[PDB]
Design a protein around this ligand. Structure first.
Ligand SMILES: [Ca+2]
Ligand SMILES: [Ca+2]
Lengths: 193, 193
């Protein structure tokens, strides 16, 4: 079952490629060529390019979650966990796992005008991410760490916005100042949203 | 010189197509087929697909500027002009000229990992937009409408971030609540950044 290793090789290379070229740059044939494999050998892991595209998206999300959310679980729900998650996500955006930055953020713009199975998977991922942030904001109000009338969705909007702007600045401008601005924007989100 | 009209037809259809498919979905052959023209007839306006791609980006930016910035010039520089520009840009994002939303925002994610002439043009456009916002923030401090130690680049970061998040929410989620959140995020940007 060194298949599991081969699968990881495929998905790993696909995430790298897709982070700069887009998910639609991902075909069975492209990956066979990149890894000096037969198309047959790729096809036994992933039947269609859409399956490969979705599995690559999922893999990248798993790697992100392991770097960003899992380390934060050593903190209690609420502001403690939220601050940890946000510090980790900023870190991940300023030093991405993939050469083209955050694949989740890029897939968002690539697929929002592309109705179908891949876009539905992008929506699913973004939904889980937003919920992880929202749960800790909600917990923080519940625990009295934020005021009773605090607007959870406003703060969430602004926190996600900071991430999107950080990724754009890093990828387009190589602007390393954006991270400190994202950090400040996240604190400001917590102060009256 | 009904060529000028033909050019507008080409660029118009190209902006529509690119807003959902990306700028890399733009070829001479695609547009010839879309408009029932010869490739020859397209090629006399735009020699290469990169020229066509850049001209389409520019056209879309011109249309945006005419809807968003020009109407705001009836206001004095500073907060008056800034609020008008931001209200217009929010309006444009909730009711876009193109079916796939803001082309400038999409090109940003499409081309940041694609070094070359198109990406350089995307950078140029985004630079002009950021400067239009920055000039009015700077004017507002200069006029004493914002406090003396107000951080112009923080506010700018957060204002641009709100636009990026609004476009993502509109395009992916059809979430019409995002506009009111963008509006609130822009006011909050002006309050201590
Ligand atoms: Ca929940
Ligand atoms: Ca200037």
């Amino acid at each position: 079952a060194e298949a599991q290793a081969t699968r990881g090789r495929i998905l790993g290379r696909a995430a790298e490629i897709a982070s700069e070229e887009g998910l639609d740059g991902i075909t069975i044939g492209r990956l066979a060529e990149e890894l000096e494999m037969s198309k047959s050998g790729v096809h036994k892991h992933f039947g269609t390019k859409e399956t490969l595209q979705i599995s690559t998206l999922d893999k990248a999300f798993v790697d992100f979650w392991h770097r960003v959310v899992e380390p934060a679980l050593a903190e209690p729900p609420g502001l403690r966990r939220l601050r940890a998650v946000c510090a980790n996500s900023v870190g991940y955006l300023e030093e991405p796992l993939l050469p083209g930055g955050c694949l989740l953020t890029a897939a968002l713009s690539e697929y929002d005008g592309r109705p179908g199975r891949v876009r539905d998977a992008v929506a699913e991922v973004w939904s889980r991410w937003r919920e992880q942030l929202r749960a800790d904001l909600t917990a923080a109000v519940d625990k009295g760490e934020l005021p009773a009338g605090f607007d959870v969705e406003q703060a969430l909007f602004e926190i996600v916005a900071a991430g999107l702007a950080l990724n754009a600045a890093m990828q387009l401008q190589h602007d390393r100042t954006a991270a400190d601005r994202a950090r400040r924007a996240i604190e400001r989100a917590l102060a009256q949203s």
